[PDB]
Structures are given as C-alpha cells and as structure tokens.
Design a protein around this ligand. Structure first.
Ligand SMILES: NC(=O)C1=CN([C@@H]2O[C@H](COP(=O)(O)OP(=O)(O)OC[C@H]3O[C@@H](n4cnc5c(N)ncnc54)[C@H](OP(=O)(O)O)[C@@H]3O)[C@@H](O)[C@H]2O)C=CC1
Ligand SMILES: CCCCCCCCCCC[C@H](O)CC(=O)SCCNC(=O)CCNC(=O)[C@H](O)C(C)(C)COP(=O)(O)O
Ligand SMILES: [Zn+2]
Lengths: 96, 87, 145, 146, 209, 342, 129, 115
C-alpha cells in the first residue's frame, strides 16, 4: 500500500517524501516518482503466524537451499511471537 | 587607554632562568596581590619556558619584557615598574 | 544567531579537569552555512575594525602560546604548586558557611542524563530518561529486526 | 550515546530579528554588519560575553582578544568561582592537582559537595578500581547518593 | 604431497638456485649485499645502485648465467625507507630456463645509469618508470613521458599521489575546446580499512621493537 | 533560506551554489554561455526549449548529471511557463529574435513573451528575475526592435518591480551575427555601407563580460530593481569597425557608399527568403543608428566585471572567416582601429 | 659516503617543487601522524604496531541528484605506512607538509593474579566468575 | 655523510646556467609557438607566462632539485616544438576558465569551511 504526500506525490516505502518547498522535485515534472506498490511493511503482516509445538524451530525461509540460511529461533516468551530476522515471518507456540 | 588590566607571568617549574622569578613568588606574592586586589596576577607555569612577563594594557595592548636569569630582587624591580605604569 | 560548530565538527583544543591540553580534530564538516567558531570572530573583527592578527589555525594556536603556554603541550601536564601561597592568599574576612545542606545537582540517573544542549537535543538519550524514570514498559523496543 | 544530539536542533544559518522581532535566516553579511554596528558603538561594561559549558579554548581566546580591543573585561562564564584570594591567579586553586591517575596510589579521599559517580563517571571508575585493589578508603561531605 | 590442498615443493631447484646465489656473491662481492631465495623457488640478487650496469652485464655475458632477457622493470615504492623507491629488474636465461631478480634502492633525487646499453628492452620500460614513479636515470637516449598525459604534472604512482588524481577535465563551449580543473568527484573513494586486527602469519612476524 | 539549498563545494561541476537557474531560450549565443557559467560553478539549471531537442544537445555536456533538465515550453500557452518556473530561484529572460516570423512578431517575442514570463515568475514567487533589453531601447527609435525592448522593459519593470533588467550595447563573439554580419558581407562583392558608415559609433562588448555579469547579478544581493547596462570598453566609428575586422580577416575591404533608401530596399528583398533571413530592414536601422551613452545607468564594472577589449577577442572569431593565406597570422600584425571612445 | 664529486648539500630536502602538489594542498594541509588505536570491541592490538600518516577532513557535501559525500580535496582517503615515526616525519619534511606527531600509547603492564580472585581480606575477591 | 652526488649542476652557478638556456630556447619558442599552434594569445602574454613559472620555483636551494626540474623544463619545451601537445595541453598552463580563488579572510569565510 502506497500513501500520497500533501504535495500530490506518492511516498516511497522508506517514508521519503519531497518537501513542497524543495527545488529538486522538478525532476518529477513530465516524469514519475514511481513507488513499489508492494510495501514490505504491508507484505508481511498479513502472512499467517504458525503454531508449531516445539521450543526451538529451524526457519529456512522456504525452498531449502534457495531460502535464507537456517536460523534457530526460540519460542519461550509467551507474550511475544518468535520470528526470523532474515525473513520476518512470525512463529508461535501452540497456545501452551 | 594604556592602563593595567592583568599580568601573565609565564615561567618554568625547573628552568634556571625561571628560578629567579620562582624565588620571587615563594614569599613576595601575598603582599603583591593584596596591594592590587583588582589586578589578577596570572602565573602560567609551563615547563621549559623562559620566564616571560605579559602586561595587558587597555585597547587590546599587551607589552612583554624579558625575565631570563632575573633574580628575585630584579624580577621585582621590572614588574614594579609595570605596576608603576598602572595607567 | 551565529552558527558555530560542534566538537566533532571542530579541530580545536580542550583542557580536562587535571589541566592537560587535548586537541580535537574535525571528523564531519559543520552542516549548512555554519562555520568555525573562531573563524566567525576573526571575520567579525575584520568587519568591525579591530581585526585580530591571527587568521589561520596555527596563528591563533600561537596566540594561546603567548597568553597561556600550558594549554599547548598536548597530553603534557604541568605540575601545579604554590599551594603554600594560595592558602595564605585566601586567609581573609572569612564569610560564614550557609546552613543549607550539600545537595549535588545530579542525584539520580535521570538528572545525570539531562545536562547539556546535545543531551537536550538528543532523542535516544531522552529514551533512557524515560527508562529510568518509568521502567521497562514503554522503552522496550521490539528487537525483531 | 550523543551523536543523535548532533542531529537535533542544529543551528545552520545566521538568524536575525525580523521587522516583527522574530529570528529569520539570512546571509552572513547582514549578521556580521548588525553585530559590528552594535559593537564598535559601545564600550566599557556595555560590551560583555558569557562563555558556555562546552566552548573550546580557541573561541575563548578569540573573545578575550576581541573584548581586549573594545575595552571590555566583563567576559563572564557560566561556572562561578570564589575569586576572593588567589582564584584565577594560582592554577593549583582549581586544578585536579594529583592527576586522575593519582587515585590508584592514595589512601583516603574526601569528596566535598560533589557526586563523582554521576558528575565524572570516568573519575568514579578510577576510585572504584583504587578502592577495589588498593583498598583505598573514601568519605564524602554531601547527600548520601550511591 | 598426499594432501592435495597445499602447493608442492621443488627442494632440488631451491638448493640449486641457492648454490648459484652464492656463486654470484663471490663473483661480484662489491655490488651484491645479500642474496635470498624465497620458499617458492625465487632466487633474488640484491645489488648496489651504482653497480647496476655491471651486474646486468655480467648476467648477460657470463656462460654460467647467460641471462639475456629483460623481463620487466619495476621500482616498488615503500615510503618507510630513506630512499623509498627500490628498483627491481627481471631477467630470464633461455639456456638455463631460470629467472633471476636483481634490485637496487634509489631515492627521488639520485640518478641511475640507464641500462639501455646492456638491455635494449629497458628503453621503453625506462620511459614508463620515470613517468609513473619519477626516478630519473642518467644518459638515457630519449627519456621522456610515454604513459601519462601530455604535460600531466606529477608522477601518479607515487605514494603521496592520490588515486583520484589532482585535476580533471571537461569540454567547455565558451572556449570551444576541452579544459582542465581541480578534481571534484561525484563519489569519493570510500576507503575500506578491512585489514584484520589479528595476526595472520606467525612465521613472517617482525621481532619485537 | 531553503533547507536543501545552502551552497556547497568549491564551485565545481558537482558543487552546489544554490542557484536554480531558469534561463529561457538558452539555445542561443547568450544562453549557451550563461548555462556554461551556471554549469561550471555548479547550479541546477532548468532550460526550456521550443526547437528540436537535437539542436539543444550541445548544452548536454555543460553540467553534472541531473543539473541540466530540458523541458518543452511554448510562448503562447501560459501553463508552459508555469511548469518551467515553478521549482525555480532565478528566472532570466533571453528570448528574442533579430527578425520577424509569421507566428511571432517583434512585439510578440520582445513584449508579449517578456510580459508573460515576468507575470508568471512573480506569481510563482521566484526571488530574482533578470530581463535582457537592448541598451539602445528607445520608444521613438526607427527600428521596431528597440521600440519593442523599451515597452517590454517597461512592462517587466511594472510586473516585476525587483527585476534586474540587462542592457547590452552590441554583443559580439563566435556566432554573434554582428561582426559575422560584416564578415559575411565580402560575399556580396564590396562592402555596402550607408554614407560609408562614417556617422555611427558603437561600443561592442564580448560575450563573457555580459555572461559573467549575469551570474554576478544573480549573486549580487543588491542587484534587484537596477537596470545595469553592459557596455564595451572602447567606442569606434562604424567605418573603423569594418576597417578593423576586414583587416583581421585580411580580406580586401571595398567601401561602397549607399543611400539610406536603397539599403532599406535591400533588406526588403532579403526578408522575402522563406528560410532564415540574412539582411532585414530592422537590421538596416540598427546598424545605421549609433550606440548611445547612459552614464547615469550603472555599468558592468560595478559587478566586478572588466570589459574585454574588442581587439583582444576579435581574433577568436575572425580566424574562421579568414582565408588560408593568413590563417595562422597572429593578432599583433593587425592594429586596433581608431578609438573615438568617450 | 660514496665520493663522486660529493658536495655538502645538507639543507633540508624539499621535493615539493618537483612533486608539484597544488599550493592549497601543500601549505593548507595539516598532515598528522600517530599509531592507530585498536578497536575496543576487538582484541587486535597487533594493528597498533605501525605508524600511520593522515590528513585533515575537508568539506563533505551531499550530491543534489542522490545525496553523496562528494569531496573537493584529493588527499581525503590517502593514508601512508611508516615503520617508525622518524621516517614518517622525514617524508613530511621532504614533501614540506605541516607535520603533527602523536606518541605510541603503550599499554600499562598490569599485574594479573587469579589467586587474588579469592582472598581473605582484600576486596579484589570476585562475587561471581 | 650528508655529502651528495650531483648529476649536472655541481652548485648554483651551473644550475643558474641551465635555467638560462631554458629561457634561451623558450624565448624564441613562444613567438612561433603562437604562430604554428593556432593560438589566439599574443606573444606578450606568452613571454611572461614563461616568466612567472621561474618565480613559481624561485625558492629551491638544492642543486639537484633545480637539475631535477631542468630536465622537465626542456621536456615540456621539446613537447611543444613538434606539436606533440594539443591546444588544450598548453592551455592548461594558461589558467583561464576556473573561478578565481579567494585570497582575503573574508572571502573564504563567506565561501565555506575551506581553511
Ligand atoms: N546585439 C544583439 O544581438 C543584442 C541582443 N540582445 C538580445 O539578447 C538575446 C540574445 O539571444 P541569443 O542567445 O544571441 O540568441 P539568438 O538571438 O541567436 O536566438 C534567439 C534565442 O531565443 C530563442 N528564441 C527565439 N525566438 C523565440 C521564440 N519565439 N520563443 C521562444 N524562444 C525564442 C532561441 O532559441 P529557439 O530559436 O530554439 O527558440 C535562442 O535561444 C536576444 O533576446 C537578443 O535580441 C540584447 C542586446 C544586444
Ligand atoms: C606557454 C608556453 C609553454 C609553457 C611554458 C611554461 C612551462 C615551462 C616552464 C619552464 C621553467 C620552469 O618552470 C622553471 C625553471 O626552468 S628553473 C627555477 C629555478 N629556481 C631556483 O633555482 C630557485 C632560486 N631562483 C632564483 O634565484 C632565481 O629566481 C632564478 C635562478 C630562477 C632566476 O634569477 P637569477 O638567475 O638567480
Ligand atoms: Zn526466516
């Protein structure tokens, strides 16, 4: 999901937006400040959180060798859901 | 103008040239500062520096005079002359 | 307003509490139109009329040499003495001591944090202020990535 | 952790009072002329200067010689000192005479009206090491801060 | 080597080159200082500057050496030495299929007798070295810039010479021909201090000092 | 000032000077050197163009990447100027043709277009504006050129009370069509001049002096409102002009006295040409009429600009027109014409 | 030492006129040398064994089109290796660079006694290893 | 010892000679340089642009450095005889297009953090 700056130009995923008083914007005139529509902020939150029944899980990122290097994440903190830093998808204990 | 504002008596803690001015401040200092409460007597003791007297006048004036190998009596003589020209 | 320069943006000399001269060197250029603090004054002196003789860093460095030889020997300390004269020079009308108890301005972690302008401007340092004054709830950032 | 402070509330360009008395960015020319115009016309105690708590020595020399040529000796400082007696005259009056390395050979230390644990954290680490290995005794006169 | 990772050795050649290393040493004791053969069978002769032309003559002429091929001319610059530039030659003997290395040292100002007479191949290798490093040799036929730009001042390969150079050029329409200006990069060379802070080779470590 | 606008760098190709230039009609002599100096010190330049982009490509190697942006624009369409001058700091007007075309008349390019460029720039809110009008701008002048400059100068002055109007006297340079004009005259037999050109004194100025004076006016904080007149360093008679330039070309000068009306007629037949005209009746009056002196108006030296002598820079143009017999001849061989300077 | 029409030219070497670095970069460049300090999170003191030559950091402005750190001083990334400090200053004199020297901060030779970690009266005993 | 081996100039006198025939070749070179090289600068500014470079190096006392420079002087000299260089190559000596460098303290303060 992409928002729109008050000046009428779409904001990028990093949140950068050209100021209305800025002079370097004119590079966008007769051109476009194209923005990747698939926001990584909005492309990972809706992925389901898994419910594996184990203390420690190896996350590979899918595809085996094609995924990120295997990382042994931990699921003991009941308030927080475990996650792999490489991928960002969620992991969770079986409701304990 | 050309009036005294402060002095800057630079000297060395070990140089024999600074020994004479060092002979001056062991005992003949409390009467000098008490005589000039407004005049601050700055002692910048940096090693391996021949003793230098720096009298700062008004209007951004600052005259210097030599104290190399000036014994206790004679260092008092030259600095009193600067004191004598307080204005 | 006269925009100067921070210590990281300045190649100049400070002195610690023990009278040892330590010189900092510029690592990042001062932002925007800000210039060197002493470069401002020398420019000010020229535009005012009482132009100072020194115009470069070494020339002003020689100026502290002739007004205070101590703070040019970098890392080299100078032995302080003549305490036998300083005490006898204090030795006077003997103003009394106030009954007010000795209370340091910095008593806890919180007031230790909030001292200078850079600390005042900083935000992450202010997060540490929230941490000590409140606890762990709000300041706990999720270390997901 | 102070680098973030160098990025917040940075003075970038000279600012002068506008027609309504509000600070507004301007070139160095107007700021230099305005200060110079109000400086050379004033003399004596009219012109003064207060140093900060983090100003470098070279700046202090710059004002010292600047107020030298305008007959100004009211170059004040934020820190206040009982100048009665030697004061500024004797550097041993205000210096850490024993040097910070001296604590590792001392026996007793008297902390008068200070919080070296917070005021000078690097200092307090040195007494802590001295108190740990050398069994150095300590005692302060002030609030029983940890 | 039963282990297939490390490189094998040719001890027969290593001693054989070492025998010839001392061979030259007695032949010209005035000029050689120390002769060393490295672990990987590379025997180097280290000769005095002023005796550059005789040793090269000896190796080209002597039957037991017969080194007649100037492989390469290099003057590797080390700022920590008094005379920085160490001029390194490179010879190949066809009849004994072996390589020799003779080298000297020379500061920025000391001139060397040009070895063009003893090796015609040195000619163009000489035009390059004075260009890149700045060490003038004496009585060269036409010693002159053959690598750098026409009128380019400064020897670029010197240690004090930045990799980005000092000037850059650009066409200008107001004068209708190209013109130079001080170098001002769009992107500076981001230096990468990637040297490991841990010792890598106990064998080559210098003695404590 | 704007946050991302503070000047930076040592005035180089990739440096930042803080000038968002908006030179109009840069595909000309004045525009070519103006964008050069702007690009040289390092400044964002927005160049609107109406002709083919191929002709505008020679301004591409004139600044760092992304500093020169070419934009399509039309004089009649108001919105065209708005797009060009929106993200701008200085908008300088260099548009104007020495001859008349069917779509654009003399008043159109010298009054109507300056009227539009001044109104939109002020409405947009640019801090500075520079307008170019002939130093001989006169409402009663016989040439429609100078009359158009005068009323056009008056309009931009009223619309933009802070505009710095520029008054060049007689520009000369490589592709200057001023001395190239008399240099090309040798093709048509002799050199036709009205009354032998003995009653006309001009004070030409070379390109870099007015060009550098433009940016110096941009950099000058007090240049707003003024009407700086850029004039040359020496005044010579019209006969002396043709005498000197033909001598530098070493072509045989053939003076030819002409009646005023016959020269006026000659411009008429040469204006018929559907392609770019060579001689126009308006050009007839301009070369006939003499340069005026305006001491009250500030000159070019006030901006720290030294007027380069014509004789010093005349060789830079005259080399192309001269033949092979004297192609390598230097400039000391020729002797500068009799100066009748004030 | 090698007598070949030797003349006693003992004046300080001045190769600046020959190397010809620009005037702004031969006078207005405070060349400073030290021994680099070991990175604290590392334990790699061996990197503190060599004298290093540096320069003064000049203006580093941001590129308008992207945002870079475009530099105007060619002597920005230039560092030089010296075995001893006298060689480092020797290069400075011949290349006429305004030189500054720091000293080698050798570590204090601290005394470590693991037996002191369990004492009878000394405070040095450790509450948890 | 500190004694060093000279190449050609044993002392100042012979070195002073060597800088003299550089002038001898250069002075008669500038006129036909402008003539042959299609240059638009006159001989007058050609002559003194050879001049000030002598004072550009009029501080060295070491005979070797003067000798190390005398070779380069005739190198650029020879490079000009046989048209090896191009117009821009010799124009690089004629500093013409760069912005003037600030000199007074007010100028560099107003320009930037350049010291
Ligand atoms: N002696 C002189 O010639 C003097 C001239 N001036 C004025 O200064 C300016 C200098 O122009 P110069 O650089 O020599 O270029 P030219 O006069 O050779 O050509 C006209 C310039 O303006 C543009 N232009 C022409 N007609 C139009 C139009 N109808 N709409 C928009 N742009 C147009 C041209 O590009 P394009 O054709 O692609 O649109 C070109 O950049 C002119 O206005 C000139 O009259 C002032 C004083 C003296
Ligand atoms: C555009 C054309 C092509 C491009 C043309 C420009 C490029 C080529 C320039 C060639 C000349 C070169 O720069 C300088 C040289 O040859 S030598 C300098 C010797 N410097 C000293 O030895 C120091 C002491 N100097 C003095 O004492 C006197 O100043 C001096 C000796 C110079 C003369 O005065 P007197 O004889 O003593
Ligand atoms: Zn993962």
């Amino acid at each position: 999901g992409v928002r729109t700056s008050p000046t009428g130009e779409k904001v990028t995923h990093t949140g950068q937006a050209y100021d209305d008083g800025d002079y370097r914007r004119v590079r966008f005139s007769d051109r476009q400040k194209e923005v990747n529509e698939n926001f990584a902020i909005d492309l990972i939150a809706e992925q389901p959180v898994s419910e594996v029944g184990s203390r420690v899980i190896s996350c590979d990122g899918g595809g085996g060798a094609l995924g990120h290097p295997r990382v042994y994440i931990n699921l003991d903190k009941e308030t927080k859901t475990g996650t792999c830093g490489y991928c960002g998808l969620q992991f969770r204990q079986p409701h304990h | 103008k050309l009036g005294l504002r402060e002095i800057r008596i630079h000297l060395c803690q070990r140089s024999p040239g600074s020994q004479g001015v060092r002979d001056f401040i062991e005992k003949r200092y409390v009467e000098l500062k008490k005589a000039n409460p407004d005049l601050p007597i700055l002692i910048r003791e940096c090693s391996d520096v021949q003793p230098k007297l720096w009298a700062r006048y008004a209007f951004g004036q600052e005259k210097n005079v030599s104290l190399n190998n000036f014994s206790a009596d004679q260092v008092t003589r030259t600095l009193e002359n600067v004191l004598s020209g307080k204005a | 307003i006269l925009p100067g320069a921070a210590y990281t943006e300045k190649s100049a000399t400070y002195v610690n509490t023990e009278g040892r001269a330590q010189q900092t060197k510029v690592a990042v250029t001062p932002p925007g139109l800000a210039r060197e603090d002493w470069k401002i004054i020398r420019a000010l002196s020229e535009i005012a009329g009482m132009t100072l003789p020194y115009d470069t860093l070494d020339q002003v460095r020689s100026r502290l040499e002739e007004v205070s030889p101590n703070l040019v020997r970098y890392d080299d300390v100078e032995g302080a003495n003549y305490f036998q004269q300083a005490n006898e020079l204090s030795k006077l009308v003997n103003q009394q001591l106030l009954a007010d108890p000795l209370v340091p301005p910095q008593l806890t972690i919180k007031d230790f944090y909030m001292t200078d302008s850079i600390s005042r401007a900083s935000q992450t340092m202010a997060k540490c202020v929230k941490a000590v004054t409140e606890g762990i709830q709000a300041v706990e950032e999720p270390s997901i990535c | 952790f102070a680098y973030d402070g160098l990025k917040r509330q940075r003075l970038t360009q000279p600012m002068i009072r506008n027609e309504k008395g509000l600070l507004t960015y301007t070139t160095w020319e107007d700021a230099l002329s305005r200060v110079a115009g109000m400086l050379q016309s004033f003399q004596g105690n009219d012109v003064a200067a207060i140093a900060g708590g983090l100003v470098d020595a070279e700046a202090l020399v710059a004002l010292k010689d600047l107020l030298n040529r305008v007959d100004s000796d009211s170059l004040c400082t934020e820190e206040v000192f009982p100048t009665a007696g030697a004061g500024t005259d004797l550097r041993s009056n205000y210096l850490l005479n024993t040097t910070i390395a001296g604590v590792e050979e001392a026996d007793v230390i008297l902390l008068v009206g200070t919080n070296p644990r917070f005021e000078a954290p690097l200092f307090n680490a040195r007494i802590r090491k001295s108190w740990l290995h050398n069994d150095l005794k300590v005692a302060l006169i002030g609030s029983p801060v940890d | 080597d039963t282990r297939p990772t490390i490189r094998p050795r040719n001890d027969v050649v290593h001693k054989q080159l070492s025998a010839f290393g001392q061979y030259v040493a007695e032949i010209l004791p005035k000029y050689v200082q120390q002769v060393q053969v490295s672990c990987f069978n590379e025997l180097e002769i280290f000769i005095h500057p002023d005796g550059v032309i005789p040793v090269l003559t000896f190796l080209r002429d002597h039957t037991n050496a017969q080194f007649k091929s100037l492989a390469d001319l290099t003057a590797v610059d080390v700022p920590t030495r008094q005379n920085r530039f160490e001029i390194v030659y490179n010879l190949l003997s066809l009849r004994f299929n072996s390589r020799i290395r003779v080298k000297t040292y020379t500061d920025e100002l000391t001139p060397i007798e040009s070895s063009v007479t003893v090796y015609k191949a040195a000619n163009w290798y000489e035009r390059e070295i004075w260009d890149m490093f700045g060490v003038f040799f004496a009585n060269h036929p036409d010693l002159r810039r053959i690598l750098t730009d026409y009128g380019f001042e400064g020897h670029p390969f010197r240690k004090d010479f930045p990799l980005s150079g000092y000037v850059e050029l650009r066409y200008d329409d107001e004068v209708k021909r190209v013109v130079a200006e001080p170098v001002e990069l769009a992107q500076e060379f981001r230096k990468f201090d990637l040297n490991s802070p841990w010792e890598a080779f106990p064998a080559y470590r210098q003695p404590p000092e | 000032l704007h946050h991302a606008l503070i000047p930076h760098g040592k005035g180089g190709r990739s440096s930042v000077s803080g000038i968002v230039a908006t030179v109009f009609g840069a595909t000309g002599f004045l525009g070519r050197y103006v964008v050069n100096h702007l690009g040289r010190m390092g400044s964002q330049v927005i160049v609107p163009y109406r002709c083919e982009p191929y002709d505008t490509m020679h301004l591409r190697p004139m600044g760092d990447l992304g500093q020169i942006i070419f934009m399509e624009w039309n004089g009649k369409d108001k919105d065209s100027i708005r797009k060009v001058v929106e993200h701008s700091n200085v908008v300088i007007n260099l548009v104007g043709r020495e001859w008349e075309t069917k779509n654009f008349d003399f008043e159109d390019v010298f009054v109507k277009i300056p009227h539009a460029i001044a109104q939109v720039s002020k409405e947009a809110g640019v801090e500075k504006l520079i307008h170019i009008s002939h130093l001989n701008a006169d409402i009663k002048s016989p040439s429609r050129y100078l009359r158009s400059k005068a009323v056009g100068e008056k309009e931009v002055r009223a619309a933009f009370p802070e505009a710095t109007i520029i008054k060049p006297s007689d520009i000369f340079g490589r592709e200057d069509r001023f001395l190239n004009y008399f240099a090309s005259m040798r093709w048509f037999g002799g050199v036709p001049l009205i009354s032998l050109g003995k009653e006309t004194v001009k004070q030409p100025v070379y390109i870099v002096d007015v060009s550098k004076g433009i940016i110096n006016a941009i950099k000058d904080p007090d240049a707003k409102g003024k009407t700086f007149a850029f004039v040359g360093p020496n005044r010579y008679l019209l006969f002396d002009l043709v005498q000197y330039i033909f001598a530098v070309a070493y072509r045989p000068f053939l003076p030819y006295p002409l009646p005023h009306f016959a020269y006026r007629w000659v411009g008429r037949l040469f204006e018929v040409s559907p392609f770019e005209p060579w001689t126009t009746r308006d050009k007839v009056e301009r070369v006939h009429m003499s340069d005026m002196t305006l001491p009250h108006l500030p000159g070019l030296e006030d901006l720290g600009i030294q007027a380069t002598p014509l004789e010093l820079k005349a060789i830079e143009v005259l080399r192309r027109h001269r033949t092979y017999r004297w192609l390598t001849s230097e400039m000391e061989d020729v002797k500068p014409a009799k100066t009748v300077n004030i | 030492t090698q007598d070949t029409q030797l003349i006693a030219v003992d004046e300080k070497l001045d190769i600046t006129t020959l190397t010809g670095v620009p005037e702004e970069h031969i006078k207005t460049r405070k060349v400073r040398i030290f021994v680099p300090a070991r990175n604290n999170m590392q334990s790699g003191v061996n990197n503190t064994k060599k004298w290093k030559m540096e320069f003064d950091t000049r203006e580093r402005w941001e590129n308008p089109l992207m945002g870079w750190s475009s530099t105007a001083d060619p002597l920005s990334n230039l560092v030089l290796t010296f075995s001893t400090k006298e060689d480092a200053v020797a290069f400075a004199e011949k290349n006429g660079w305004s030189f500054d020297v720091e000293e080698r901060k050798v570590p204090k030779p601290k005394s470590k006694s693991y037996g002191a970690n369990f004492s009878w009266n000394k405070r040095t005993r450790v509450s948890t290893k | 010892g500190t004694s060093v081996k000279p190449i050609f100039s044993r002392d100042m006198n012979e070195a002073k000679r060597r800088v003299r025939e550089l002038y001898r070749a250069w002075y008669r070179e500038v006129p036909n340089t402008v003539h042959l090289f299609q240059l638009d600068i006159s001989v007058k500014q050609g002559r003194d642009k050879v001049r000030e470079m002598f004072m550009k190096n009029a501080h060295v006392t070491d005979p070797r450095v003067v000798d190390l420079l005398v070779i380069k002087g005739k190198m650029e000299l020879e490079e000009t005889i046989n048209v090896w260089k191009q117009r821009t190559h010799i124009m690089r000596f004629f500093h013409e297009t760069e912005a003037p460098r600030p000199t007074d303290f007010l100028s560099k303060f107003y320009v930037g953090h350049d010291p």
